[PDB]
Protein backbone atom coordinates (compact mmCIF):
# COMPACT_ATOMS: atom_id res chain seq x y z
CA UNK A 1 0.00 0.00 0.00
CA UNK A 2 2.81 2.52 0.82
CA UNK A 3 4.25 3.80 -2.49
CA UNK A 4 7.93 4.81 -2.37
CA UNK A 5 8.94 8.22 -3.84
CA UNK A 6 9.29 8.47 -7.63
CA UNK A 7 11.89 11.33 -7.61
CA UNK A 8 14.59 10.92 -10.28
CA UNK A 9 17.53 10.69 -7.85
CA UNK A 10 15.66 8.70 -5.11
CA UNK A 11 17.14 5.32 -6.33
CA UNK A 12 20.63 6.86 -5.75
CA UNK A 13 19.75 7.66 -2.05
CA UNK A 14 21.26 4.29 -0.99
CA UNK A 15 21.27 5.23 2.72
CA UNK A 16 17.45 5.66 2.96
CA UNK A 17 16.32 2.23 1.80
CA UNK A 18 17.12 -0.87 -0.29
CA UNK A 19 17.08 -4.67 -0.30
CA UNK A 20 20.70 -4.92 1.08
CA UNK A 21 20.38 -3.67 4.75
CA UNK A 22 23.15 -1.00 4.38
CA UNK A 23 20.60 1.77 5.16
CA UNK A 24 18.92 3.89 7.90
CA UNK A 25 15.56 2.01 7.64
CA UNK A 26 13.69 5.21 6.69
CA UNK A 27 11.16 3.56 4.32
CA UNK A 28 9.92 1.47 7.32
CA UNK A 29 9.11 4.77 9.13
CA UNK A 30 7.41 6.22 6.00
CA UNK A 31 5.31 2.99 5.69
CA UNK A 32 4.17 3.40 9.35
CA UNK A 33 2.73 6.83 8.19
CA UNK A 34 5.56 9.11 9.41
CA UNK A 35 7.02 11.66 6.95
CA UNK A 36 7.60 14.73 9.22
CA UNK A 37 4.22 16.53 8.93
CA UNK A 38 3.94 19.30 11.55
CA UNK A 39 7.65 19.18 12.58
CA UNK A 40 9.94 22.21 12.10
CA UNK A 41 13.73 21.82 11.58
CA UNK A 42 16.28 24.62 11.24
CA UNK A 43 19.78 24.25 9.71
CA UNK A 44 22.44 26.45 11.39
CA UNK A 45 24.89 27.11 8.54
CA UNK A 46 25.77 29.56 5.65
CA UNK A 47 22.15 30.12 4.48
CA UNK A 48 19.32 28.27 2.69
CA UNK A 49 18.18 28.71 -0.92
CA UNK A 50 14.51 29.06 0.04
CA UNK A 51 13.37 29.20 -3.61
CA UNK A 52 15.08 25.86 -4.52
CA UNK A 53 12.48 23.77 -6.46
CA UNK A 54 13.00 20.88 -3.98
CA UNK A 55 12.83 23.10 -0.81
CA UNK A 56 10.24 25.83 -1.57
CA UNK A 57 7.22 23.60 -0.85
CA UNK A 58 8.50 22.83 2.67
CA UNK A 59 10.22 26.19 3.40
CA UNK A 60 9.27 27.91 6.66
CA UNK A 61 10.24 31.57 7.25
CA UNK A 62 9.47 31.00 10.95
CA UNK A 63 12.40 28.53 11.10
CA UNK A 64 14.80 31.05 9.54
CA UNK A 65 16.88 34.13 10.20
CA UNK A 66 20.01 35.87 8.95
CA UNK A 67 22.22 36.57 11.92
CA UNK A 68 25.21 37.67 9.76
CA UNK A 69 23.32 40.60 8.15
CA UNK A 70 20.66 41.03 10.89
CA UNK A 71 17.55 40.40 8.75
CA UNK A 72 14.88 37.60 8.46
CA UNK A 73 15.98 36.32 5.02
CA UNK A 74 18.63 33.54 5.10
CA UNK A 75 19.20 33.50 1.31
CA UNK A 76 22.88 32.54 0.67
CA UNK A 77 25.40 35.02 -0.72
CA UNK A 78 26.15 33.86 -4.32
CA UNK A 79 29.83 33.76 -5.44
CA UNK A 80 31.80 32.22 -8.39
CA UNK A 81 33.19 29.59 -6.00
CA UNK A 82 29.68 28.51 -4.72
CA UNK A 83 31.08 28.95 -1.17
CA UNK A 84 27.70 29.27 0.64
CA UNK A 85 26.07 26.04 -0.55
CA UNK A 86 26.35 23.85 2.55
CA UNK A 87 23.10 24.93 4.29
CA UNK A 88 21.08 24.23 1.13
CA UNK A 89 22.63 20.73 0.90
CA UNK A 90 21.78 20.03 4.57
CA UNK A 91 18.21 21.36 4.19
CA UNK A 92 17.56 18.91 1.33
CA UNK A 93 18.82 15.97 3.40
CA UNK A 94 16.19 16.73 6.03
CA UNK A 95 13.21 17.88 3.97
CA UNK A 96 13.60 17.90 0.16
CA UNK A 97 10.08 17.59 -1.34
CA UNK A 98 8.96 14.12 -2.50
CA UNK A 99 7.13 13.04 -5.70
CA UNK A 100 7.79 16.35 -7.51
CA UNK A 101 10.13 15.16 -10.34
CA UNK A 102 13.11 17.03 -8.84
CA UNK A 103 16.30 15.68 -7.26
CA UNK A 104 15.61 13.07 -4.43
CA UNK A 105 13.71 13.31 -1.14
CA UNK A 106 14.40 14.34 2.43
CA UNK A 107 14.26 11.86 5.32
CA UNK A 108 11.29 13.92 6.62
CA UNK A 109 9.98 14.98 3.20
CA UNK A 110 6.79 16.53 4.69
CA UNK A 111 8.55 18.50 7.51
CA UNK A 112 8.93 22.31 7.55
CA UNK A 113 12.51 23.46 6.94
CA UNK A 114 14.38 26.69 7.55
CA UNK A 115 17.89 27.95 7.97
CA UNK A 116 19.92 30.38 10.03
CA UNK A 117 22.55 32.20 7.99
CA UNK A 118 25.19 32.42 10.73
CA UNK A 119 28.53 31.15 9.26
CA UNK A 120 28.99 33.73 6.46
CA UNK A 121 30.77 36.22 8.68
CA UNK A 122 32.48 36.39 12.07
CA UNK A 123 31.03 33.74 14.40
CA UNK A 124 30.90 35.37 17.84
CA UNK A 125 29.26 34.17 21.07
CA UNK A 126 26.31 36.56 20.42
CA UNK A 127 25.89 35.19 16.82
CA UNK A 128 25.84 31.63 18.19
CA UNK A 129 23.36 32.49 20.99
CA UNK A 130 20.95 34.26 18.63
CA UNK A 131 21.05 31.19 16.28
CA UNK A 132 20.61 28.48 18.95
CA UNK A 133 17.87 30.59 20.58
CA UNK A 134 15.93 31.36 17.38
CA UNK A 135 12.09 31.00 17.75
CA UNK A 136 12.32 28.18 20.35
CA UNK A 137 8.55 27.69 20.60
CA UNK A 138 8.24 27.21 16.79
CA UNK A 139 11.45 25.32 15.80
CA UNK A 140 11.54 21.77 17.17
CA UNK A 141 14.98 20.59 16.00
CA UNK A 142 18.19 22.49 15.22
CA UNK A 143 20.88 20.82 13.11
CA UNK A 144 24.51 22.09 13.25
CA UNK A 145 27.28 20.46 11.22
CA UNK A 146 30.25 22.60 12.39
CA UNK A 147 32.06 23.97 15.43
CA UNK A 148 35.55 24.91 16.58
CA UNK A 149 38.43 24.29 14.15
CA UNK A 150 39.02 20.58 13.41
CA UNK A 151 42.81 21.09 13.33
CA UNK A 152 43.54 18.56 16.12
CA UNK A 153 44.94 21.29 18.40
CA UNK A 154 41.94 23.39 19.51
CA UNK A 155 40.03 23.04 22.78
CA UNK A 156 36.95 25.29 22.65
CA UNK A 157 33.27 25.35 23.36
CA UNK A 158 30.27 27.60 23.80
CA UNK A 159 31.07 30.84 25.59
CA UNK A 160 28.51 32.24 28.14
CA UNK A 161 25.70 33.46 25.79
CA UNK A 162 25.77 30.25 23.73
CA UNK A 163 25.82 28.02 26.86
CA UNK A 164 22.85 30.07 28.23
CA UNK A 165 21.05 29.53 24.87
CA UNK A 166 21.52 25.72 25.25
CA UNK A 167 20.20 25.92 28.89
CA UNK A 168 17.17 28.05 27.88
CA UNK A 169 16.54 25.80 24.88
CA UNK A 170 16.44 22.47 26.74
CA UNK A 171 14.57 23.97 29.74
CA UNK A 172 11.90 26.30 28.22
CA UNK A 173 12.10 25.56 24.48
CA UNK A 174 9.37 23.55 22.74
CA UNK A 175 6.77 24.31 25.43
CA UNK A 176 9.10 23.10 28.18
CA UNK A 177 9.90 19.74 26.47
CA UNK A 178 13.25 21.18 25.30
CA UNK A 179 14.79 22.10 21.94
CA UNK A 180 16.51 19.18 20.18
CA UNK A 181 20.03 20.20 19.13
CA UNK A 182 21.62 17.69 16.69
CA UNK A 183 25.38 18.10 16.15
CA UNK A 184 28.02 16.57 13.90
CA UNK A 185 30.94 15.15 15.96
CA UNK A 186 33.54 16.65 13.57
CA UNK A 187 35.67 16.22 10.42
CA UNK A 188 39.15 16.29 12.08
CA UNK A 189 40.03 12.63 11.60
CA UNK A 190 43.12 13.24 9.40
CA UNK A 191 44.47 15.68 12.04
CA UNK A 192 43.94 12.96 14.76
CA UNK A 193 41.35 15.22 16.43
CA UNK A 194 39.45 13.87 19.51
CA UNK A 195 35.86 15.24 19.60
CA UNK A 196 35.57 15.72 23.44
CA UNK A 197 37.79 18.84 22.82
CA UNK A 198 34.78 20.41 20.95
CA UNK A 199 32.41 21.71 23.63
CA UNK A 200 29.39 21.76 21.28
CA UNK A 201 29.38 18.03 20.42
CA UNK A 202 30.76 17.21 23.94
CA UNK A 203 27.68 18.94 25.52
CA UNK A 204 24.95 16.78 27.12
CA UNK A 205 22.39 19.14 25.46
CA UNK A 206 23.43 18.11 21.91
CA UNK A 207 22.60 14.75 20.36
CA UNK A 208 25.95 14.03 18.67
CA UNK A 209 26.33 12.03 15.48
CA UNK A 210 29.28 10.43 13.69
CA UNK A 211 29.61 8.77 10.23
CA UNK A 212 30.00 5.33 8.64
CA UNK A 213 31.02 4.73 5.02
CA UNK A 214 28.78 2.70 2.62
CA UNK A 215 30.86 -0.45 3.26
CA UNK A 216 30.50 0.04 7.07
CA UNK A 217 33.92 1.55 7.82
CA UNK A 218 35.14 4.53 9.90
CA UNK A 219 35.75 7.29 7.32
CA UNK A 220 39.06 9.13 7.05
CA UNK A 221 37.48 12.31 8.52
CA UNK A 222 35.84 10.72 11.59
CA UNK A 223 36.77 11.85 15.13
CA UNK A 224 36.49 9.29 17.92
CA UNK A 225 35.18 10.32 21.36
CA UNK A 226 33.02 9.18 24.27
CA UNK A 227 30.44 12.02 23.85
CA UNK A 228 29.09 10.65 20.51
CA UNK A 229 25.67 8.96 20.75
CA UNK A 230 25.03 7.39 17.31
CA UNK A 231 25.91 7.30 13.57
CA UNK A 232 24.43 7.88 10.16
CA UNK A 233 25.89 6.99 6.77
CA UNK A 234 28.00 9.48 4.87
CA UNK A 235 30.90 9.50 2.32
CA UNK A 236 34.06 7.36 2.30
CA UNK A 237 36.53 6.38 -0.43
CA UNK A 238 35.98 6.96 -4.17
CA UNK A 239 34.39 3.49 -4.67
CA UNK A 240 31.69 4.27 -2.02
CA UNK A 241 28.61 6.35 -2.69
CA UNK A 242 28.00 9.76 -1.11
CA UNK A 243 24.99 11.88 -0.04
CA UNK A 244 22.47 12.95 -2.72
CA UNK A 245 20.71 16.26 -2.03
CA UNK A 246 19.67 19.78 -3.16
CA UNK A 247 22.47 22.15 -4.16
CA UNK A 248 22.91 25.89 -4.63
CA UNK A 249 21.61 27.46 -7.90
CA UNK A 250 18.58 25.11 -8.03
CA UNK A 251 20.80 22.11 -8.74
CA UNK A 252 21.18 18.54 -7.41
CA UNK A 253 24.41 17.05 -6.01
CA UNK A 254 25.49 13.44 -5.58
CA UNK A 255 28.76 14.36 -3.75
CA UNK A 256 27.76 15.76 -0.35
CA UNK A 257 30.25 14.43 2.26
CA UNK A 258 31.68 14.33 5.81
CA UNK A 259 30.22 14.09 9.27
CA UNK A 260 28.75 17.52 8.42
CA UNK A 261 26.34 15.54 6.05
CA UNK A 262 25.50 12.94 8.80
CA UNK A 263 23.96 15.39 11.33
CA UNK A 264 21.14 16.51 8.93
CA UNK A 265 20.17 12.86 8.23
CA UNK A 266 19.91 12.33 12.02
CA UNK A 267 17.83 15.55 12.34
CA UNK A 268 15.42 14.15 9.73
CA UNK A 269 15.13 10.80 11.58
CA UNK A 270 14.50 12.74 14.83
CA UNK A 271 11.76 14.71 12.98
CA UNK A 272 9.98 11.43 12.05
CA UNK A 273 10.30 10.28 15.70
CA UNK A 274 8.82 13.57 16.99
CA UNK A 275 5.85 13.21 14.62
CA UNK A 276 5.25 9.72 16.14
CA UNK A 277 5.21 11.28 19.65
CA UNK A 278 5.10 15.09 19.96
CA UNK A 279 5.43 14.91 23.78
CA UNK A 280 8.99 13.48 23.75
CA UNK A 281 11.44 15.60 25.77
CA UNK A 282 15.05 16.39 24.77
CA UNK A 283 16.23 13.59 27.12
CA UNK A 284 13.56 11.10 25.90
CA UNK A 285 15.00 11.58 22.37
CA UNK A 286 18.51 10.65 23.57
CA UNK A 287 17.13 7.55 25.39
CA UNK A 288 15.36 6.44 22.15
CA UNK A 289 18.61 6.78 20.19
CA UNK A 290 20.58 4.72 22.77
CA UNK A 291 17.97 1.94 22.82
CA UNK A 292 17.28 1.61 19.05
CA UNK A 293 20.64 2.25 17.35
CA UNK A 294 22.27 -0.73 15.65
CA UNK A 295 25.97 -1.73 15.81
CA UNK A 296 25.62 -4.67 13.33
CA UNK A 297 28.15 -4.70 10.46
CA UNK A 298 29.84 -1.42 11.51
CA UNK A 299 33.59 -2.16 11.62
CA UNK A 300 35.71 -0.74 14.49
CA UNK A 301 38.51 -2.17 16.70
CA UNK A 302 36.99 -0.72 19.94
CA UNK A 303 33.46 -2.22 20.19
CA UNK A 304 32.84 -2.93 23.88
CA UNK A 305 29.84 -4.17 25.84
CA UNK A 306 28.85 -1.76 28.61
CA UNK A 307 27.30 -2.56 32.06
CA UNK A 308 23.78 -3.03 30.68
CA UNK A 309 24.76 -5.26 27.73
CA UNK A 310 24.84 -2.62 24.95
CA UNK A 311 27.68 -2.44 22.42
CA UNK A 312 29.28 1.00 22.21
CA UNK A 313 32.20 2.42 20.18
CA UNK A 314 34.03 5.76 20.33
CA UNK A 315 33.69 5.99 16.50
CA UNK A 316 29.97 5.16 16.29
CA UNK A 317 28.42 5.59 19.75
CA UNK A 318 25.55 3.06 20.01
CA UNK A 319 25.59 2.41 16.24
CA UNK A 320 23.58 3.32 13.20
CA UNK A 321 20.27 5.15 13.62
CA UNK A 322 17.26 2.97 12.75
CA UNK A 323 14.30 5.18 11.78
CA UNK A 324 11.70 2.37 11.74
CA UNK A 325 12.72 1.30 15.28
CA UNK A 326 12.86 4.92 16.57
CA UNK A 327 9.27 5.71 15.41
CA UNK A 328 7.94 2.34 16.70
CA UNK A 329 9.46 2.82 20.20
CA UNK A 330 8.40 6.52 20.36
CA UNK A 331 4.64 5.83 20.08
CA UNK A 332 4.13 4.35 23.58
CA UNK A 333 7.25 5.87 25.22
CA UNK A 334 6.72 6.87 28.88
CA UNK A 335 8.34 10.26 29.66
CA UNK A 336 11.55 9.86 31.68
CA UNK A 337 11.60 11.17 35.25
CA UNK A 338 13.09 14.66 35.95
CA UNK A 339 16.86 14.92 35.52
CA UNK A 340 18.96 14.55 38.70
CA UNK A 341 22.55 15.85 38.99
CA UNK A 342 25.02 14.44 41.54
CA UNK A 343 28.27 16.40 42.03
CA UNK A 344 31.25 14.62 43.57
CA UNK A 345 34.46 16.58 44.18
CA UNK A 346 37.09 13.80 44.03
CA UNK A 347 40.56 15.13 45.01
CA UNK A 348 41.66 15.79 48.60
CA UNK A 349 44.91 17.47 47.25
CA UNK A 350 46.54 18.28 43.83
CA UNK A 351 48.28 15.32 42.13
CA UNK A 352 51.46 15.26 40.05
CA UNK A 353 50.77 13.71 36.61
CA UNK A 354 54.28 12.47 35.64
CA UNK A 355 54.27 9.45 33.29
CA UNK A 356 50.95 8.09 34.60
CA UNK A 357 48.40 9.06 37.24
CA UNK A 358 45.50 6.95 38.44
CA UNK A 359 42.78 8.37 40.75
CA UNK A 360 40.32 5.86 42.27
CA UNK A 361 37.25 6.91 44.24
CA UNK A 362 34.24 4.97 45.51
CA UNK A 363 31.08 7.09 45.39
CA UNK A 364 27.53 6.61 46.67
CA UNK A 365 25.98 8.75 43.82
CA UNK A 366 24.12 11.01 46.29
CA UNK A 367 22.57 8.15 48.29
CA UNK A 368 19.81 9.38 50.63
CA UNK A 369 19.38 12.67 48.72
CA UNK A 370 16.83 13.94 46.09
CA UNK A 371 19.64 13.78 43.48
CA UNK A 372 20.38 10.06 44.15
CA UNK A 373 21.11 8.43 40.76
CA UNK A 374 20.75 4.69 40.18
CA UNK A 375 20.27 5.04 36.34
CA UNK A 376 22.98 7.13 34.70
CA UNK A 377 22.53 9.16 31.52
CA UNK A 378 25.61 11.35 30.82
CA UNK A 379 28.69 11.41 33.08
CA UNK A 380 31.36 14.13 33.06
CA UNK A 381 34.85 14.23 34.49
CA UNK A 382 35.44 17.99 34.85
CA UNK A 383 39.20 18.36 35.01
CA UNK A 384 41.50 21.24 35.77
CA UNK A 385 45.15 20.45 35.04
CA UNK A 386 48.41 21.95 33.89
CA UNK A 387 50.70 20.19 31.41
CA UNK A 388 53.62 21.24 29.19
CA UNK A 389 52.38 19.50 25.94
CA UNK A 390 48.67 18.88 26.01
CA UNK A 391 48.49 16.52 23.03
CA UNK A 392 50.73 13.96 24.72
CA UNK A 393 47.95 13.19 27.27
CA UNK A 394 45.47 10.33 26.96
CA UNK A 395 42.69 10.19 29.58
CA UNK A 396 40.35 7.28 30.41
CA UNK A 397 37.49 6.95 32.89
CA UNK A 398 36.26 3.50 34.06
CA UNK A 399 32.80 3.21 35.55
CA UNK A 400 31.87 0.91 38.49
CA UNK A 401 30.38 -1.53 35.88
CA UNK A 402 33.82 -1.77 34.16
CA UNK A 403 33.03 0.43 31.13
CA UNK A 404 36.24 2.18 29.97
CA UNK A 405 35.53 5.53 28.27
CA UNK A 406 38.34 7.31 26.45
CA UNK A 407 37.85 10.93 27.50
CA UNK A 408 40.85 12.16 25.48
CA UNK A 409 43.09 10.35 23.00
CA UNK A 410 46.63 11.62 22.18
CA UNK A 411 46.49 14.59 19.69
CA UNK A 412 49.95 14.86 18.05
CA UNK A 413 49.41 18.38 16.70
CA UNK A 414 48.32 19.78 20.11
CA UNK A 415 51.46 21.48 21.44
CA UNK A 416 49.58 23.78 23.88
CA UNK A 417 51.00 24.43 27.36
CA UNK A 418 47.53 25.81 28.49
CA UNK A 419 46.20 22.52 29.90
CA UNK A 420 42.48 22.12 30.69
CA UNK A 421 40.54 24.69 32.72
CA UNK A 422 37.55 22.84 34.24
CA UNK A 423 36.96 21.03 30.93
CA UNK A 424 33.85 18.83 31.17
CA UNK A 425 34.89 15.62 29.33
CA UNK A 426 31.65 13.68 28.74
CA UNK A 427 30.81 10.04 28.14
CA UNK A 428 27.54 8.46 26.97
CA UNK A 429 29.03 4.89 27.21
CA UNK A 430 27.70 4.22 30.74
CA UNK A 431 24.07 5.18 29.90
CA UNK A 432 21.59 3.20 32.10
CA UNK A 433 24.39 1.87 34.38
CA UNK A 434 24.23 2.26 38.18
CA UNK A 435 26.99 4.83 38.96
CA UNK A 436 27.48 3.81 42.64
CA UNK A 437 30.89 2.23 43.32
CA UNK A 438 34.46 2.69 42.19
CA UNK A 439 35.27 5.12 39.36
CA UNK A 440 38.89 5.23 38.06
CA UNK A 441 40.46 8.18 36.19
CA UNK A 442 43.68 7.39 34.29
CA UNK A 443 45.87 10.19 32.85
CA UNK A 444 48.94 9.03 30.87
CA UNK A 445 51.80 10.65 29.00
CA UNK A 446 51.73 8.72 25.66
CA UNK A 447 55.15 10.08 24.56
CA UNK A 448 58.71 9.24 25.61
CA UNK A 449 59.31 12.96 26.51
CA UNK A 450 59.88 13.96 30.13
CA UNK A 451 56.62 15.90 30.36
CA UNK A 452 55.21 17.41 33.59
CA UNK A 453 52.07 18.85 35.12
CA UNK A 454 49.52 18.63 37.93
CA UNK A 455 45.83 17.68 38.19
CA UNK A 456 44.32 20.28 40.56
CA UNK A 457 40.61 19.43 40.27
CA UNK A 458 38.52 16.43 39.31
CA UNK A 459 34.74 16.75 39.74
CA UNK A 460 32.68 13.73 38.72
CA UNK A 461 29.26 14.97 37.62
CA UNK A 462 26.58 12.33 37.17
CA UNK A 463 23.22 12.99 35.46
CA UNK A 464 20.28 10.58 35.54
CA UNK A 465 17.28 9.23 37.41
CA UNK A 466 16.43 6.64 40.11
CA UNK A 467 13.59 4.80 38.21
CA UNK A 468 12.33 3.10 35.01
CA UNK A 469 15.14 0.66 34.16
CA UNK A 470 14.93 -2.06 31.48
CA UNK A 471 16.33 -5.58 31.97
CA UNK A 472 19.94 -5.52 30.55
CA UNK A 473 20.62 -6.56 26.94
Ligand SMILES: CC(=O)NC[C@H]1CC[N@H+](Cc2cc(Oc3cnc(N4CC[NH+](CCC(=O)[O-])CC4)nc3)nc(-c3cc(Cl)cc(Cl)c3)c2)CC1
Pocket residue numbers: 044045046083084085086119123124125128129131132144145146147148149156157158159162
Ligand atom coordinates in the same frame (compact mmCIF):
# COMPACT_ATOMS: atom_id res chain seq x y z
C1 LIG B 1 35.04 33.95 24.69
C2 LIG B 1 34.18 34.06 23.45
O1 LIG B 1 33.32 34.92 23.30
N1 LIG B 1 34.40 33.14 22.50
C3 LIG B 1 33.69 33.15 21.22
C4 LIG B 1 33.91 31.88 20.45
C5 LIG B 1 33.26 31.96 19.07
C6 LIG B 1 33.62 30.71 18.27
N2 LIG B 1 33.13 29.49 18.98
C7 LIG B 1 33.47 28.23 18.22
C8 LIG B 1 32.76 28.12 16.90
C9 LIG B 1 33.43 28.42 15.73
C10 LIG B 1 32.74 28.27 14.54
O2 LIG B 1 33.42 28.62 13.42
C11 LIG B 1 33.03 28.21 12.15
C12 LIG B 1 33.03 29.11 11.10
N3 LIG B 1 32.73 28.75 9.84
C13 LIG B 1 32.46 27.46 9.65
N4 LIG B 1 32.17 27.07 8.38
C14 LIG B 1 31.87 25.67 8.07
C15 LIG B 1 32.58 25.22 6.81
N5 LIG B 1 32.09 26.10 5.72
C16 LIG B 1 32.33 25.54 4.33
C17 LIG B 1 31.44 24.36 4.01
C18 LIG B 1 31.47 23.92 2.56
O3 LIG B 1 31.64 24.80 1.68
O4 LIG B 1 31.29 22.72 2.30
C19 LIG B 1 32.65 27.45 5.97
C20 LIG B 1 32.03 28.01 7.26
N6 LIG B 1 32.43 26.51 10.60
C21 LIG B 1 32.74 26.90 11.83
N7 LIG B 1 31.47 27.89 14.45
C22 LIG B 1 30.83 27.57 15.59
C23 LIG B 1 29.41 27.18 15.46
C24 LIG B 1 28.49 27.49 16.46
C25 LIG B 1 27.17 27.16 16.29
CL1 LIG B 1 26.04 27.57 17.56
C26 LIG B 1 26.70 26.51 15.17
C27 LIG B 1 27.61 26.22 14.18
CL2 LIG B 1 27.07 25.43 12.74
C28 LIG B 1 28.96 26.52 14.31
C29 LIG B 1 31.45 27.68 16.83
C30 LIG B 1 33.69 29.42 20.38
C31 LIG B 1 33.32 30.68 21.15
Ligand SMILES: [Ca+2]
Pocket residue numbers: 066069071072073074075
Ligand atom coordinates in the same frame (compact mmCIF):
# COMPACT_ATOMS: atom_id res chain seq x y z
CA1 LIG C 1 19.71 38.26 4.45
Ligand SMILES: [Ca+2]
Pocket residue numbers: 007054096097098099100101102103104105
Ligand atom coordinates in the same frame (compact mmCIF):
# COMPACT_ATOMS: atom_id res chain seq x y z
CA1 LIG D 1 12.28 15.93 -4.83
Ligand SMILES: [Ca+2]
Pocket residue numbers: 148149150151185186187188193194195198223
Ligand atom coordinates in the same frame (compact mmCIF):
# COMPACT_ATOMS: atom_id res chain seq x y z
CA1 LIG E 1 36.93 18.36 16.21
Ligand SMILES: [Cl-]
Pocket residue numbers: 341
Ligand atom coordinates in the same frame (compact mmCIF):
# COMPACT_ATOMS: atom_id res chain seq x y z
CL1 LIG F 1 23.49 21.33 34.89
Ligand code: NA
Pocket residue numbers: 155156157158199
Ligand atom coordinates in the same frame (compact mmCIF):
# COMPACT_ATOMS: atom_id res chain seq x y z
NA1 NA G 1 36.26 27.39 25.85
Ligand code: NA
Pocket residue numbers: 183200201202203204205206207208227
Ligand atom coordinates in the same frame (compact mmCIF):
# COMPACT_ATOMS: atom_id res chain seq x y z
NA1 NA H 1 26.52 16.01 22.54
Ligand code: NA
Pocket residue numbers: 304305306307401402403
Ligand atom coordinates in the same frame (compact mmCIF):
# COMPACT_ATOMS: atom_id res chain seq x y z
NA1 NA I 1 32.00 -4.42 29.92
Ligand code: NA
Pocket residue numbers: 400401434435436437438
Ligand atom coordinates in the same frame (compact mmCIF):
# COMPACT_ATOMS: atom_id res chain seq x y z
NA1 NA J 1 28.10 -0.19 41.99
